[PDB]
A paper describes a structure:
[name] belongs to the evolutionarily conserved spectraplakin family of proteins. [name] is a key crosslinker of microtubule and F-actin networks. The carboxy terminus of [name] contains the [name] domain, which is responsible for microtubule binding. In this study, we demonstrated that [name] can promote microtubule association with tight junctions in intestinal epithelial cells, and disruption of the microtubule network or deletion of [name] inhibits tight junction dynamics and impairs intestinal wound repair, suggesting that the dynamics of cell/cell junctions and focal adhesions may be regulated via similar mechanisms, involving spectraplakin-mediated cytoskeletal coordination.
To address this issue, we isolated the [name]-[name] protein and resolved its X-ray structure. The resulting experimental electron density maps revealed that the asymmetric unit of the [name]-[name] crystal consists of one protomer. The crystal structure of [name]-[name] was determined to a resolution of 1.5 Å, revealing that the [name]-NT molecule is folded into an elongated polypeptide that is ∼32.7 Å long and ∼17.9 Å wide. There is one α-helix at the amino terminus (α1), followed by five antiparallel β-strands (β1, β2, β3, β4 and β5), folding into a central β-sheet from which a flexible β-hairpin structure with a positively charged surface extrudes, and another C-terminal α-helix (α2). These features are interconnected with flexible coil loops. The microtubules have highly negatively charged surface. Thus, it is most likely that the [name] domain binds microtubules through the flexible, positively charged central β-sheet. To test our hypothesis, we mutated five positively charged amino acids at β2, β3, β4, K53, R63, R66, R69 and R75 to aromatic residues K53Y, R63Y, R66Y, R69Y and R75Y. Our results indicate that the mutation in the five residues almost completely inhibits microtubule binding with [name]’s [name] domain. By contrast, expression of [name] mutant failed to rescue the dynamic feature of tight junctions in vitro or cell motility, strongly suggesting that [name] regulates these processes through its interaction with microtubule network.
Author numbering: 18 to 98
The structure:
């Protein structure tokens, strides 16, 4: 394995950050195509892109960095909010 495509890089970085969850019921994230993800208990699909090496998640009309999205949504990260 060699990360080469944007889809590959995004998926690796989503994996790295989601793996930091400490919840009893882990915050689940699934790749649904090269550019859409399902996060946590929400069934909503979100676009995900990489821009200058930062992964961003589509949220209400704009883009939010992945780390901030996880702070806002993964219960074990709420103390960063
Ligand atoms: Ni968590």
């Amino acid at each position: 394995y060699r990360p080469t495509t944007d889809a590959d890089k995004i998926e690796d970085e989503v994996t790295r950050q989601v793996a930091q969850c400490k919840c009893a019921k882990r915050f689940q994230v699934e790749q649904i195509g090269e550019n859409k993800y399902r996060f946590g208990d929400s069934q909503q699909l979100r676009l995900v892109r990489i821009l200058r090496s930062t992964v961003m998640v589509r949220v209400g009309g704009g883009w939010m960095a992945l780390d901030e999205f996880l702070v806002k949504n993964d219960p074990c990260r709420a103390r960063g909010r």
